[PDB]
Design a binder for these strands. Structure first.
Length: 342
DNA sequence: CGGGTTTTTGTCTGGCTTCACACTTGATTTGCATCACTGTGTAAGACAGGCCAGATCCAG
């Protein structure tokens, strides 16, 4: 817990709320800029590099067989190492306010002189495909030497029937179904769980060997931020998979929280949004066991007077137990701070 | 495809209004053309080129 100011280069206007920092072997990379990419960097992926408390965003290139995906403002990021380390991107929101549904897979194809070359391959789904949506979260699951993705519901626009031009930007939470996506083939399947009763968005999901921990979130159906955490334990036999969910005591009511990993089988979460005009300022610690959980309240960081009164704040995860968050200014549009918690 | 029964009107009828209608000229009052100018055009992005830095290579 140690705040620190971070200066910026010339291209500060390219950062916007909802970006996604991706980490590949120590190097943190930027994605999800504002507007369509210009001739400064046609790809849109930037080398997120901080040195001497100073940010320097520089362009990056793709391979000769990649796919130039549009910048997304609320994708679903997750790590996947099952080989070549690679990330997964689903959903998002294009700069034309259009929701995407295609899955993109990032990967490092070549590198030299500290200059990487990405490989963005397109991935399509079959069977029970999910509605294009944002604010959701996807995780990976390992079971009996086999991988599988878990996609929880989020929010999206009106369906193609009731959507009218007088409410063209209305948003409703998607149905609380669990989607299992096989990355090797591309076949998704929708399951129903009686425990999942209401839609949830902007939540935080913790992944492990074979169980996903959904903690907190925001429900648009009733405008309530619940304080219940879920435990979706799955299994991958030779036959059809089986999913189960059990509610658990001791939840947390936070929306738009930023999660990061500190040690092996241990996570720390920072504040998000507690109420509409009330802002969560104290952090929480998540300690895992083998079939149990544990939450506690760490020492509150030495917040500054500008953050203590700012209404909006956003950020993401760098990867080395470090959080990069920003504060809006006036008319220098954002003030970006970093946070290290070992 | 046209018979009854009221509406809808121009007159017949001649005799009472209130406005209409020839001339001036000297003003007096309106109406309209003319002339040199006006505002709204009002922040960033693409590209080539010199410059060191540092990586790339040479030979004792």
């Amino acid at each position: 817990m140690s705040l620190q100011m971070v200066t910026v280069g010339h291209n500060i206007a390219l950062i916007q709320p909802g970006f996604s920092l991706m980490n590949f072997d120590g190097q943190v990379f930027f994605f999800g800029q504002k507007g369509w990419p210009k001739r400064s960097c046609p790809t849109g992926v930037f080398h997120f590099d901080i040195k001497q408390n100073h940010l320097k965003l520089k362009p990056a290139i793709f391979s000769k067989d990649s796919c130039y995906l549009p910048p997304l403002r609320y994708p679903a990021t997750c790590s996947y190492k099952g080989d070549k380390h690679q990330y997964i991107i689903h959903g998002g929101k294009t700069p034309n306010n259009e929701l995407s549904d295609k899955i993109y897979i990032m990967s490092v194809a070549c590198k030299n002189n500290k200059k990487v070359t990405f490989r963005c391959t397109e991935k399509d789904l079959v069977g029970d495909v999910p509605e294009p949506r944002y604010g959701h979260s996807i995780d990976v699951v390992y079971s009996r030497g086999k991988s599988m993705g878990v996609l929880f519901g989020g929010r999206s626009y009106m369906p193609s029937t009731q959507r009218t031009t007088e409410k063209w930007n209305s948003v409703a939470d998607c149905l609380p179904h669990v989607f299992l996506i096989d990355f090797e083939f591309g076949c998704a399947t929708s399951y129903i769980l009686p425990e999942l009763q209401d839609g949830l968005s902007f939540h935080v999901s913790i992944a492990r060997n074979d169980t996903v921990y959904i903690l907190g979130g925001h429900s648009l159906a009733s405008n309530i931020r619940p304080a219940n955490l879920y435990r979706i334990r799955v299994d991958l036999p030779l036959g059809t998979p089986a999913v189960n969910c059990t509610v658990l005591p001791g939840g947390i009511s936070v929306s738009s929280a930023i999660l990061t990993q500190t040690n092996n089988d241990e996570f720390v979460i920072v504040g998000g949004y507690q109420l509409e005009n009330q802002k969560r300022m104290v952090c929480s610690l998540v300690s895992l066991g083998d079939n149990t959980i544990e939450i506690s309240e760490m020492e509150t960081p030495d917040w500054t007077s500008d953050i203590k009164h700012s209404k909006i704040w956003f950020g993401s995860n760098m990867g080395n137990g470090t959080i990069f968050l920003g504060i809006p200014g006036d008319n220098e549009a954002f003030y970006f701070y970093t946070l290290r918690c070992s």
